[PDB]
Design an enzyme around this catalytic site. Sequence first.
Site, mmCIF file in Angstrom:
data_model
loop_
_atom_site.group_PDB
_atom_site.id
_atom_site.type_symbol
_atom_site.label_atom_id
_atom_site.label_comp_id
_atom_site.label_asym_id
_atom_site.label_seq_id
_atom_site.Cartn_x
_atom_site.Cartn_y
_atom_site.Cartn_z
ATOM 1 N N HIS A 23 0.805 -1.220 0.000
ATOM 2 C CA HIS A 23 0.000 0.000 0.000
ATOM 3 C C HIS A 23 0.842 1.276 0.000
ATOM 4 C CE1 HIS A 23 0.371 -0.425 4.505
ATOM 5 N NE2 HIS A 23 0.480 0.889 4.417
ATOM 6 N N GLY A 57 2.957 5.467 10.223
ATOM 7 C CA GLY A 57 4.307 5.292 9.716
ATOM 8 C C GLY A 57 5.022 4.053 10.212
ATOM 9 N N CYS A 94 4.136 0.960 9.394
ATOM 10 C CA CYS A 94 3.973 -0.156 8.482
ATOM 11 C C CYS A 94 5.331 -0.585 7.933
ATOM 12 C CB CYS A 94 3.014 0.215 7.350
ATOM 13 S SG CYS A 94 1.316 0.180 7.960
HETATM 14 C C1 LIG Z 1 0.918 1.736 8.165
HETATM 15 O O1 LIG Z 1 1.879 2.630 8.577
HETATM 16 C C2 LIG Z 1 -0.379 2.059 8.922
HETATM 17 C C3 LIG Z 1 -0.258 1.632 10.429
HETATM 18 C C4 LIG Z 1 -1.478 1.944 11.290
HETATM 19 C C5 LIG Z 1 -1.647 3.428 11.423
HETATM 20 C C6 LIG Z 1 -2.105 3.617 12.804
HETATM 21 N N1 LIG Z 1 -1.650 2.450 13.481
HETATM 22 C C7 LIG Z 1 -1.305 1.553 12.615
HETATM 23 O O2 LIG Z 1 -0.917 0.519 12.976
HETATM 24 N N2 LIG Z 1 -1.452 1.410 8.194
HETATM 25 C C8 LIG Z 1 -2.506 2.053 7.740
HETATM 26 O O3 LIG Z 1 -2.697 3.210 7.873
HETATM 27 C C9 LIG Z 1 -3.528 1.224 6.980
HETATM 28 C C10 LIG Z 1 -3.401 1.461 5.520
HETATM 29 C C11 LIG Z 1 -4.389 0.605 4.749
HETATM 30 C C12 LIG Z 1 -4.150 0.784 3.283
HETATM 31 C C13 LIG Z 1 -4.158 -0.808 5.014
HETATM 32 N N3 LIG Z 1 -4.860 1.580 7.355
HETATM 33 C C14 LIG Z 1 -5.407 1.374 8.505
HETATM 34 O O4 LIG Z 1 -4.795 0.864 9.394
HETATM 35 O O5 LIG Z 1 -6.674 1.759 8.647
HETATM 36 C C15 LIG Z 1 -7.439 1.295 9.691
HETATM 37 C C16 LIG Z 1 -8.751 1.771 9.661
HETATM 38 C C17 LIG Z 1 -9.338 2.171 8.487
HETATM 39 C C18 LIG Z 1 -10.648 2.612 8.502
HETATM 40 C C19 LIG Z 1 -11.324 2.657 9.684
HETATM 41 C C20 LIG Z 1 -10.725 2.251 10.845
HETATM 42 C C21 LIG Z 1 -9.428 1.788 10.838
#
Ligand SMILES: *[C@H](O)[C@H](C[C@@H]1CCNC1=O)NC(=O)[C@H](CC(C)C)NC(=O)OCc1ccccc1
EC number: 3.4.19.12
Lengths: 299, 299
Positions: free
Chosen positions: B39, B141, B143
């Site tokens: 992603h 950040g 990921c």
């Molecule tokens: C990668 O850095 C990030 C890590 C998350 C950010 C906050 N804590 C974490 O562990 N991943 C994401 O941002 C990820 C990206 C998607 C394309 C997979 N999205 C995500 O974690 O979203 C969660 C979410 C989305 C919608 C509603 C509730 C939670």
Amino acid sequence: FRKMAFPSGKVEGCMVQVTCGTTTLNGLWLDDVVYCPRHVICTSEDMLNPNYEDLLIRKSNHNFLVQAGNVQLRVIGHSMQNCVLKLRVDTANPKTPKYKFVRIQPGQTFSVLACYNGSPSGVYQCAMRPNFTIKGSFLNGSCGSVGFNIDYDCVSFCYMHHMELPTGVHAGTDLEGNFYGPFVDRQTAQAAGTDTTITVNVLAWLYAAVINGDRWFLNRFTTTLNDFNLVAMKYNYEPLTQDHVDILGPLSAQTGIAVLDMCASLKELLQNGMNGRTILGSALLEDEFTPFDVVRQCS
Amino acid sequence: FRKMAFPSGKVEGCMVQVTCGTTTLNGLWLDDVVYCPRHVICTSEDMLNPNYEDLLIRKSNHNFLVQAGNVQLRVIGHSMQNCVLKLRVDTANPKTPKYKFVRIQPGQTFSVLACYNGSPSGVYQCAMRPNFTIKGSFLNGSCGSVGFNIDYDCVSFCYMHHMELPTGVHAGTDLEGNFYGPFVDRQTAQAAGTDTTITVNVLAWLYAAVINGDRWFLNRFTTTLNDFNLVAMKYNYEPLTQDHVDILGPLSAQTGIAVLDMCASLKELLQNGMNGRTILGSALLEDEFTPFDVVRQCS
Ligand SMILES: *[C@H](O)[C@H](C[C@@H]1CCNC1=O)NC(=O)[C@H](CC(C)C)NC(=O)OCc1ccccc1
Ligand SMILES: *[C@H](O)[C@H](C[C@@H]1CCNC1=O)NC(=O)[C@H](CC(C)C)NC(=O)OCc1ccccc1
């Protein structure tokens, strides 16, 4: 909220083993000096009331086996500073990080790199108790393992491991060989004094709860620092210092809750209990997270 | 007895930063390949519903900025394997450890090296929950941070980080890019299945409590395997198998407490509660130590 150790790689590159006779322990190689507990020069029977000054007189540079892995580092000088031995070696460690030696206060936390025979085994967070013990996980051969904090790639070494107390907690020195607490490096019967709860860290935990939206315990009172300290000691809580108040500054600014207002909330918790309610999902107040730990985890 | 992570140095030397457009996360640099969550190629608009094969075909090698410390690595090829992108670079990582990629089973533990902007930040122990989430500590950040186990200097990578669920737990993939659990790398709120407690781990932890001088929870009763499992299922505990009983063998022999005798202890704990008492300083039954974890630390 979880106990998070610092990444250990900068310290791993500094761990060596030090052997005298049949006793091996760990040492810390920085530049051209190896630091280790002085009781490496003890025979198993000489540990009850060792005469370290006399035992060291009988030692020469060539009595010390210092190894990085299986590679010997030639010792070219030795001296004793308090409870630590300093072995000058003929090779400067190329993995030496930027570093400092610091003496920490009760309540501060640090990462421990548990080592055996110079080989790192695991890493975990410890807090220095007010009785100057730590709740470590140490086995035979762990002496010379160190505790540290890392700030912007500068490693602040604060603990070197020397002994286990009968209660199963642990005691040690700073890197200048001065014990934390009233302990001595002799295999004698020593006892940890009565411990207390780390008030500044409980307050940090209450701020962490507030940051995350859990704030039922915020009351309408305030208190003076002296009034709080006198009540806190009736509950086996540590009194606060001026330095404690100041290290709570950042969390107090972030939440808008004055430090003395939070003290009044804690005082109410102590005098009436949690009344079957939780804080951050827990019924116990947690006292091993420092204000820095709370901010470090949240950012 | 503490939750103890593996020393993280062998993994720290592999962490890099990967940037595509406005999106930055961490990558794992082994030999001449950097592994990272796919992603990274998504803009904020793409994140809501991405067609990854379509998005990837439109990227060039130069759309990927990989930084290892201050030096930039030149991407010379790229492929996608499930949810992971493999960026071929023109430099081999000289600090590559001996390593394997493994897919771990629910209930197994691993160490997480949390990283931001390619820089390691903290290390801690996690377990793969039965519902295939992990209870981590991850911020924006993070990921591309990885989980791992280390055996005789061989690093077994088992986890790469991708997302946080609305409940605050975390989800990710193996190094082959296949998610643990029914999750997808799309920016949508996803629920996990109902979690359950890792029974074999609770029993290992009770045995650790006996090795550390705590026995208040033991009793004179015993139980059959099937009768225990009836009660365990009632309390949302995972079944205990004969393989589990066998894996607990060494811990039973060390304490002289038969596995099914400890099962009767846990059944009583589950039916009566802990009465406001604590085990190893915990007010809840701990299920993130494997039998191997207990043995390694305790011996
Ligand atoms: C990668 O850095 C990030 C890590 C998350 C950010 C906050 N804590 C974490 O562990 N991943 C994401 O941002 C990820 C990206 C998607 C394309 C997979 N999205 C995500 O974690 O979203 C969660 C979410 C989305 C919608 C509603 C509730 C939670
Ligand atoms: C250092 O390698 C070692 C660490 C102990 C070993 C088991 N767990 C530990 O933390 N330190 C010692 O063995 C230490 C040596 C003295 C010179 C300080 N002795 C010690 O810890 O003694 C424990 C003890 C004292 C008195 C009676 C019974 C046991």
